């Protein structure tokens, strides 16, 4: 079918031991550990890989080797547990040629208080969001072309338009923001960290500060970026409603950023204090005040050396039995967005935020000869774990006791599932056993009339037992059940190491 390259995070438990990641290969019908020399074993001591994010061009292919105005490189950013983010360029070339996977750029979350937990690390339209479960968000502005996208843990042989990825209401601040912060072009000192400001003094690599910082008084567990609006994000905490919030941009920060970008383009600058002393000013802020507003925002900017303190505003909130919402995703229905959420005690919900606050679709208590097997399979579901969207309608949920395909439009009878059609709900019974992550790769898709699909797929599941398992499965047409089988498995024989979440690198 084709080789699969991915990376699995392995954190340790005992103190004074490295916690890192390992690159794995699924080739032919075998799993293999790729021998690779990662970074030095002192950075990973008491700091485990908390998040992965892979940046690559959408339409154009990646570069082969490290004089082009249009960038075509490949990026991996790693989020640690001590507030350090590592950016490594040319990931696949270094993996194939067996080079050293040393970080190229270092990012720091500077307005802080080695026990920081990453609620999320995502990228959208030149903005990198890193949010902490205490409820604090750091925003970095990157110098990337528009066609770069984040590679998710999902492959689909056809590419639907149900996600707002392939491309009036903006205010003046947004217009000057997108005008002043544009992709310049790949040259000397024109790397990805161009619009960032360094800490004035990880070997000799310069460390950079975030562009924006936010703190909300709720604490978040899951976090997503709005694909429609760049400065909009939505968060979920346990036993709390869904929140959709918007960045409020003052004119002072936009003017400061535009003037700073013009000043930098006028002139590697590692310390702006040395340049200010050479220019007879003593500080960059005196220089930009001479070259030039709100007093408090400017004082906040000059106090934290470039980072701007911002305040958010809630634009949507959903409306006793508590909710333990595990996952959600934003889907275009083919502001025309829907939000689909899976909740731990087997519950599925769908909201339309423009028209209603209450859920427009709600399937609750899903567990409450072929029909006997279907009833037995539904009775064994315990707790929903993972959600994917194949299309604008299909929902691919992974429980700990099976796999569900649910068509949320053709359901017409809540609390009595036997009166619905044959292909609206399909179940594969399999004891997964307290998963951590998964990589869905759709090998063979076939859609047919009245929108009924049959597919063959692959699964990459890590568990609390310490096992990495690759499985093959198939959902048929006009059949209420399915079929799964195990292709390969590897067991981690360590009493301290764990097998944490994993990120997909490549699939042929």
């Amino acid at each position: 079918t084709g080789r699969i390259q991915f990376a699995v995070s392995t954190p340790c438990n005992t103190k004074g031991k490295p916690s890192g990641y390992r690159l794995f290969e699924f080739k032919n019908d075998r799993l293999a550990l790729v021998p690779s020399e990662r970074g030095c074993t002192k950075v990973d001591v008491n700091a485990n890989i908390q998040a992965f994010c892979y940046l690559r061009p959408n339409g154009r292919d990646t570069s082969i080797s490290p004089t082009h105005i249009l960038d075509s490189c490949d990026y991996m950013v790693l989020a640690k547990s001590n507030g350090f983010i590592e950016i490594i360029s040319n990931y696949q070339y270094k993996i194939k040629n067996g080079l050293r996977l040393a970080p190229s750029y270092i990012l720091r979350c500077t307005p802080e208080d080695s026990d920081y937990m990453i609620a999320g690390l995502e990228y959208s339209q030149g903005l990198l969001y890193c949010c902490m479960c205490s409820g604090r968000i750091y925003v970095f502005v990157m110098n990337l072309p528009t066609d770069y996208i984040q590679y998710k843990n999902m492959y689909n042989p056809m590419f639907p338009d149900c996600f707002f990825k392939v491309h009036t209401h903006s205010s003046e601040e947004e217009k000057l923001f997108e005008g002043s912060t544009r992709y310049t072009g790949r040259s000397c000192s024109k790397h990805i960290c161009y619009f960032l400001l360094p800490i004035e003094p990880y070997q000799g690599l310069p460390i950079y500060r975030p562009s924006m910082y936010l703190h909300i008084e709720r604490g978040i567990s899951t976090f997503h970026i709005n694909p429609l609006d760049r400065f909009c994000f939505m968060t979920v905490s346990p036993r709390s409603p869904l929140f959709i919030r918007k960045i409020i941009l003052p004119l002072t920060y936009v003017t400061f950023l535009s003037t700073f970008i013009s000043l930098k383009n006028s002139i590697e600058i590692l310390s702006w204090d040395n340049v200010a002393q050479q220019n007879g000013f003593g500080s960059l802020f005196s220089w930009i005040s001479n070259k030039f507003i709100n007093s408090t925002i400017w004082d906040d900017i000059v106090k934290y050396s470039g980072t701007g303190m911002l305040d958010s505003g809630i634009v949507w909130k959903q409306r006793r039995r508590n909710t333990f919402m595990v996952d959600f995703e934003i889907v275009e229905k083919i502001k025309k967005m829907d939000i689909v959420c899976i909740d731990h005690f087997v519950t599925l919900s769908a909201f339309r935020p423009r028209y209603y606050d209450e859920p427009i679709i709600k399937i609750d208590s899903l567990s409450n000869d072929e029909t006997a097997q279907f009833k037995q399979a539904l009775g064994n579901l315990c707790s929903f774990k993972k959600l994917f969207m194949l299309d604008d309608s299909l929902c691919f949920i992974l429980d700990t006791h099976g796999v569900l395909l649910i068509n949320r439009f053709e359901i017409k009878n809540t609390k009595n599932l036997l009166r619905n059609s044959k292909d609206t709900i399909r179940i594969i019974p399999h004891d997964f056993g307290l998963i951590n992550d998964t990589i869905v790769i759709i090998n063979d898709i076939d859609v047919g009339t009245d929108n009924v699909c049959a597919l063959t797929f692959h699964l990459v599941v890590t568990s609390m037992a310490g096992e990495i398992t690759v499985l093959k499965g198939e959902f048929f047409k006009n059949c209420r059940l399915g079929r799964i089988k195990l292709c390969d498995s590897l067991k981690l024989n360590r009493k301290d190491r764990f097998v944490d979440k994993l990120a997909l690198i490549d699939y042929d």
């Binding site: 195990l486 292709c487 590897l490 024989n493």
Partner: protein, 114 residues
């Protein structure tokens, strides 16, 4: 042959036939555990599921054909003796533990027979 007869006399006991042994669920559970141990091993698990060094393969993922046909012959002998109907009658048993254990054993034997 005497142990299989003892197992068949233990499993046939019910609410109305609690004379020879007393319909005790512990003896039924022990007999089902013997029948489970006779039909379960690593090669059968690999055949019916699949299609230091810090990362080792599981024993069920790693000669197996001879062990598999020996286990299938054991299953056919158990069917010919007549314990399959007793396993069904223990699907229709009062206690829950014997019900679930007999259901798992019957599903495994059904999947081995085909």
């Amino acid at each position: 042959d005497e142990i299989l007869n003892i197992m068949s006399e233990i499993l046939v006991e019910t609410t109305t036939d609690s004379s020879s042994y007393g319909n005790d669920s512990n003896l039924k559970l022990a007999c089902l555990w013997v029948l489970n141990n006779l039909l379960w091993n690593s090669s059968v698990s690999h055949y019916t599921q699949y299609a230091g060094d810090e990362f080792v393969r599981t024993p069920a993922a790693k000669s197996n054909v001879q062990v598999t046909r020996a286990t299938v012959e054991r299953c056919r002998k158990l069917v010919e003796v007549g314990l399959y109907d007793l396993v069904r009658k223990n699907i229709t048993d009062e206690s829950l533990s014997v019900r679930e254990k007999a259901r798992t054993l019957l599903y495994h034997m059904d999947l081995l027979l085909k």
